[PDB]
Design a protein around this ligand. Structure first.
Ligand code: NAD
Ligand code: NAD
Ligand code: NAD
Ligand code: NAD
Ligand code: NAD
Ligand code: NAD
Ligand code: UDP
Ligand code: UDP
Lengths: 263, 181, 164, 272, 261, 271
């Protein structure tokens, strides 16, 4: 069992990763500045002997002894984002260099500051021999996700839950636990080249509208880049195993829980 | 300290926090992550005991070092005054604090007047300190499920009755417990 | 290895002598705000003594075994000394595993029991009374209280000190 | 007349830019860490009342009162990727912060290679413009040659001048049908000053659209040098600069090559 | 009347200087880390509206708004060098910043206080800092250091104790302190940039001093064996000269030593 | 073989030292802020595995792990305040470094102690006495050779310049005053000898062989092959000779020729 640091672990993906790593009995250190993260996503672990929550900004230098580093800190405010993606990543690479820790960069499918984040990691690998991992994350959904990210899956759930009409090409979405398995898979693998972590199983916009409507139980009216993971299938033995129905239900539950709290 | 219980209701009426015991949801309808232990520079007009003690002392020292710059914590206020010329239940409250009233509500389910009193003492010239049955609470919560100095120097008094105050608090407690499921 | 903050003072300097007579590596930290360097100058030069011009509100990084924190003197500087200065010695204590004795009177106490409960700092709190009690006996009491096992407060009603 | 700061001003382009701004009577300050720049490139201005040379790294914060900022600070690649990346990102952020703090206009010297860190460098300038209202300018610079240029930059024009001067055979990869577009530095320098004082905050290509085949450069340089050397075996679109700035390369190739050949020859003789 | 900073103003020369400037109704400020100075030397003034004491090391940057800076701050060799170099750099830095006239208290052993001189003239030449350099000669009087080891202290100590005056024919000249202070203020408020000798041009041999002090102490003590100050420049520019006879001087100094012991 | 730090190693003396120590197979680190030094004087070693160049100012604290420290970082003569700070704060720092990492420090002082070089020596002995730092002090006399500052107002530099440029060789007085000059490789050998010796007291490193001003003028005139017109207007190394067994071995004509070559190459570059 290892000492793991998770930047942005108080967010959507980070908190779910935090759950799994705590379950495996690791010393998880979460660093978050709560810009888009919430203390609530990890508050169940506050007090636990192997967990620690630090209100810290990755733009500011951080000095801790850890074994692994999941760098997931990246949020409207373009300057703060650019500084986080660059100065923040440089710092985590500096920290991994100083304490001899492995760093996984949570990059994005949008690379087809995140682009230069990949490069910075490879700059430290090529030059300072820092063990790096680069995951190219595609569209991900689930509990604790940002409800108003304007994305097509979130809108349909919201509109369905409030009885509003569902206002309406293919979309690929993966459940968050799939991604979390993928990150952990990649982290402990020996693949240092970039790896696509997304769900290649696509569905049309209308198909999601019709599926979510049924799963919610609403009387709402309907008005008027596919991820290739053959590398992950082969190098990691990884693929999404959580069915669309099971994942959507857990997410619908979370949204439902949140909307009732705002009344 | 405005991301808290009294902090949020005081922010509300008038329209910096590390979210240690505060939450963003308490003020997010108006949208700095700063620990008051660290020196803060902005131009204005008006469980873990170590962190609590460092906050109340080093923190209050800063705000007095800020107040002085831009024009036991009680004693530090009067030290700055003399030397440097420097001048409860409700929603969003801590449920698991251990308070008698709070405990009864949790077992049964299973503040604006303070905001006025802070404002009234603030815009007044009184720097001197000013103050702002068990069964009957139990039987009332079950159904629904000395300030004389503030009366002469301020003319302020609590005007919200007891039942108006508990029901508004009960609503909040219920809302939270459903969220925990 | 013993560190005495405010050891160029009334009590600190008699405390300084007694500990230098027993041959401990005394280090006196002081800012001379109220303490006179004459009080301890007769020790300057010897191998065991060291005098450091230092204000406790500024962090102090030294390596000692015991800390006789007696630093206490303009009301604002007095409050920064009692609060921050104490937080800096408990931080020094916690950092170098030093046993700390507070010199309370008949807030800093609370910090001292905070660091014991939370960070496991060995602390000693002496509620000192009016001294001119004679100073030689107070040193006897402070030195006795440091090398004992009583964490709680002890007056120097001395029913507790006499029996413990 | 203005107070101008030039980061990387001790290098190839920056020093030529420095010459021009000094001649125009400005208070030019050069900030450089001499990682690839040379003090000789600007030593002629040292002592002059309007010039100041600072040994500074743009990765470290800098606080000086200026009106305009020419951000040319970026090492070249023949090397040290971490320092390059840190310079292009933390360096730019430092200068954008300065420009915001003192109300200064910043021209970023970007590159044609964006068609690393130069890309995210552009984005940061616009982030500051959009959010902090900082006046920014972005030049996308194409291949530039001339005096004070790095001779071993692996570039095709540098190699031909070198091999010709040493009587070595001029090596041509392939059939030499590939085309290369090169601008003299005083042209680029002219584009940069124009762009700075214009009101075009969108990226502007500064390059020489006049192309020539590899074989054409080989033979021209061969003749201009006067050697018995043997021959062995992204085009800049600048209509935006031509229209918004009234700028175009006006220095003929021959005049520019003679001057570059001179610099190389003077340097090679000093290394003997 | 001006805002005067005096570094080392709690020392021997420093403190008598603080006495005059305070008596003249100035706003004096002492910055001192107490390395070889004592609070009782200036305790007389603490609490006064125009006096302020600061326990401060000049090796650490200082930022106060003063008009004139008397830089007198100066066993432990490394700390002394740091104090005399960095310390002086800081006060010259301070003076450049708040436009103050700095007077350096240099010594006659210049014939690193030499470099402190050279720094003051580079800040004058290059940054336009008004500077005053006093080359100070051997001084004695009240509040002087009994155990410093100089020929005059040992000859009062050993006289007063009854111990033999230890003598190692060569000549020394000594001025009284109230005379060095009068000439320090006179140099500050003058227009002389170049260094000016502050001393007493009356040499006495080493053995002469030992028998002299004896007849002043009047104790049963025996004797057992084992750069002349030119002040003409200070005369004509400053109108300053030692006015205190040696005899009266040594008496006042013995009265300090005898009271202490 | 040791890890050696050379401050100011991009200067005249420093780069020639750097060459020698790199040839001897040491791990040489050059620290310089290029205020009077030039990267070209050392660039041939950049890329080599045992060489590292750091653009650093010794007035700023430096933390490196080394065995020996050659402290040559001091500008030549303009800006007095920066010279003063480098010689004092710069030295305090390099001694502070030496104390922290246990390194032997050689200070390059000057014969002018017969500015800031005097007090630089004292600081070294303060650290030796108080902090047990192993220190060495070389009192360097006038040195000439390739890579030297040409416009240092020095009598030999001026004579080569004026001769190379066909200008008249101006000689003040009758030119009967005498000057002693050493070639740089001689000075370097002395420095390495002084560094690896056990002599911690100051040691003069100079060429005791003196010549009159007019003698240098006429020799330099002849060695250049110029038609320049002539117009009109001491190092004691016996301790170095005995303790280190060192003495200058490079003849004057040989040293002057190599120096004349350097000046000549430089003036042509200034065309
Ligand atoms: N969410 C997706 O579907 C998706 C898609 C592609 C890529 N990704 C990648 O996955 C990672 C996790 O994203 P998410 O969807 O959980 O977003 P999120 O906002 O839930 O997670 C970001 C977390 O980082 C923290 N943070 C941001 N800036 C910080 C700073 N300067 N200092 C300290 N903490 C800071 C925030 O407070 C938040 O807790 C992201 O980095 C993103 O690039 C996510
Ligand atoms: N509510 C009551 O009945 C009551 C009773 C007695 C005293 N008080 C006083 O009234 C004040 C209001 O209490 P509340 O009910 O709003 O508590 P709260 O916990 O809701 O709010 C306190 C806020 O201060 C912030 N904070 C704490 N330590 C900090 C630090 N070191 N740096 C930055 N921010 C920090 C927390 O994040 C929190 O938001 C409290 O300070 C307390 O001292 C309240
Ligand atoms: N008998 C009494 O006089 C009496 C009565 C009640 C309480 N006490 C307590 O006993 C303790 C000893 O008191 P004392 O009379 O010996 O004190 P004192 O005033 O004689 O000595 C206090 C010492 O602390 C030093 N000091 C003050 N502030 C400092 C700072 N910020 N940093 C470093 N040094 C600093 C002073 O220079 C002085 O040497 C005190 O802490 C006081 O609270 C004493
Ligand atoms: N010259 C070309 O052909 C060409 C082509 C495309 C783009 N550009 C752009 O033009 C700009 C200037 O190019 P150049 O050929 O003059 O480059 P150059 O390599 O000759 O000079 C860059 C200058 O900046 C200095 N510098 C480097 N890193 C620094 C740091 N971290 N802090 C402070 N100073 C630093 C270097 O020493 C050098 O003087 C570059 O940014 C380059 O991207 C040039
Ligand atoms: N009086 C003489 O015999 C004599 C003779 C020649 C020269 N001088 C010069 O006159 C000046 C005054 O001498 P003095 O006899 O008063 O000496 P002194 O030792 O009595 O005075 C020195 C004062 O400087 C202070 N000091 C020392 N280091 C300090 C630091 N780092 N920061 C702040 N304060 C510091 C000490 O606390 C002390 O008060 C000295 O500079 C000395 O060089 C004196
Ligand atoms: N050659 C001589 O004639 C001679 C005579 C007497 C003494 N010396 C001494 O020999 C040493 C070498 O002198 P030189 O002739 O090589 O002169 P130089 O000017 O060529 O060497 C000084 C070197 O130190 C560097 N430097 C200056 N300030 C610095 C700082 N703050 N940080 C880092 N580097 C800095 C300069 O860039 C330069 O490379 C000097 O200490 C000088 O005092 C030389
Ligand atoms: O005059 C200045 C002001 C800013 N900075 C640097 O530029 C960075 C970015 O500035 P910004 O305003 O974005 O950051 P902030 O000061 O608000 O934290 C800062 O970290 C500073 O280090 C600078 O070099 N010169
Ligand atoms: O004061 C000192 C001397 O001032 P100066 O301006 O000459 O130095 P700088 O501030 O430029 O570093 C700066 O450290 O402490």
């Amino acid at each position: 069992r290892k000492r793991i640091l998770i930047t942005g672990g108080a967010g959507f993906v980070g908190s779910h990763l935090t759950d799994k790593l705590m379950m495996d009995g690791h010393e998880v250190t979460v660093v978050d500045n709560f810009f888009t993260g919430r203390k609530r996503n990890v508050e169940h672990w506050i007090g636990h002997e192997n967990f620690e929550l630090i209100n810290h900004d990755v733009v500011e230098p951080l000095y801790i002894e850890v074994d692994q580093i999941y760098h997931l800190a990246s949020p409207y405010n373009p300057i703060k984002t650019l500084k986080t993606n660059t100065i923040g990543t440089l710092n985590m690479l500096g920290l991994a260099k100083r304490v001899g820790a492995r760093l996984l960069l949570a990059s994005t499918s949008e690379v087809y500051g995140k682009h230069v984040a990949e490069t910075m990691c490879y700059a430290y690998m090529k030059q300072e021999g820092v063990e790096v991992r680069v995951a190219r994350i595609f569209n991900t959904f689930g509990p604790r996700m940002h409800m108003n990210d304007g994305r097509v899956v979130s809108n349909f759930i919201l509109q369905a839950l409030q009885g509003e009409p569902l206002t309406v090409q293919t979309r690929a979405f993966q459940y968050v636990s799939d991604l979390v398995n993928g990150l952990v898979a990649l982290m402990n693998s020996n693949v240092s080249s970039p790896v696509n972590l997304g769900n290649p199983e696509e569905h049309t916009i209308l198909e999601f509208a019709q599926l979510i409507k049924n799963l919610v139980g609403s009387g709402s009216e309907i008005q008027f880049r596919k991820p290739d993971i053959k590398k992950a299938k082969l190098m990691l033995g990884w693929e999404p195993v959580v069915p669309l129905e099971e994942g959507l239900n857990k997410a619908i539950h979370y949204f439902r829980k949140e909307l009732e709290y705002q009344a």
